[PDB]
Design a binder for this molecule. Structure first.
Ligand SMILES: [Cu+2]
Ligand SMILES: [Cu+2]
Ligand SMILES: [Zn+2]
Ligand SMILES: [Zn+2]
Lengths: 150, 150
């Protein structure tokens, strides 16, 4: 199965992210996001595919396994915790593989929202309660609803 | 379960459509679309949730049963054949039900695209092959990917 999202927001940040999965195996994520300031930016799947109030109506992180916020490599993470992407020269181009997200079944991210954040995700190690919820990633620069692609 | 989509295009047509389904019953669809010419406009669910080339990437009608295009009341119809909405004073505000689409299972429209068309859908009664594919509904004025909503 293949899926895609077009990211847009209130400013100039925009991008495209592609997703692919064979069988019920890992999902391959490839994207390009333009308009970011240099450095790390949190990249997460939020629960709702609702863009009626911009990125704010996407809700919190997708967390069907009922864990705290973490890094992609941790056992204690949300399904939607895909870590940080790195921007240089105003662009982030990335390829990740993840085994917790899916394009089918209960952990399906189809009809959910991908969000790129203002600040780096602290990966649950920030020393405060917010770190265990959002990684202190701040504002939502751009987002899109994930749909089926050819 | 509830779902939503925000409709946008390359012109001034825009809107919001809400979907709700209780148990495995008919889905209620309620929307408002602005910027339309008076009269009938086709309203369908296209297969892909891909808005990378605007509405032109949404594919054809959602059609898992391999049927011909028809009216919502016909047995020979695509799952995505929701008929026409009527615009008055620039606005189409509508409330319909459908028994073929779903928000869960094989006929789920989450992650797919709702499209509002330039012209009336001829409901398969146009007398040519295109009628049997798209209803002769013409261009795609606005579209959006369907996602989960609170
Ligand atoms: Cu987030
Ligand atoms: Cu159509
Ligand atoms: Zn998280
Ligand atoms: Zn059709």
């Amino acid at each position: 199965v293949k899926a895609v999202c077009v990211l847009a927001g209130s400013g100039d940040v925009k991008g495209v992210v592609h997703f692919e999965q064979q069988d019920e195996g890992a999902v391959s994520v490839e994207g390009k996001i333009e308009g970011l300031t240099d450095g790390l930016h949190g990249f997460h799947i939020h629960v709702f595919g609702d863009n009626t109030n911009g990125c704010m109506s996407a809700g919190s992180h997708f967390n069907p396994e009922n864990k705290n916020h973490g890094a992609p490599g941790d056992t204690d993470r949300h399904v939607g915790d895909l870590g940080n992407v790195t921007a240089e020269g105003g662009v982030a181009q990335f390829k990740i593989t993840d085994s917790l997200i899916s394009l089918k079944g209960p952990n399906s991210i189809i009809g959910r929202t991908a969000v790129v954040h203002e600040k780096a995700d602290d990966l649950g190690k920030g020393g405060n309660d917010e770190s265990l919820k959002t990684g202190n990633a701040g504002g939502r620069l751009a987002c899109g609803v994930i749909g089926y692609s050819p």
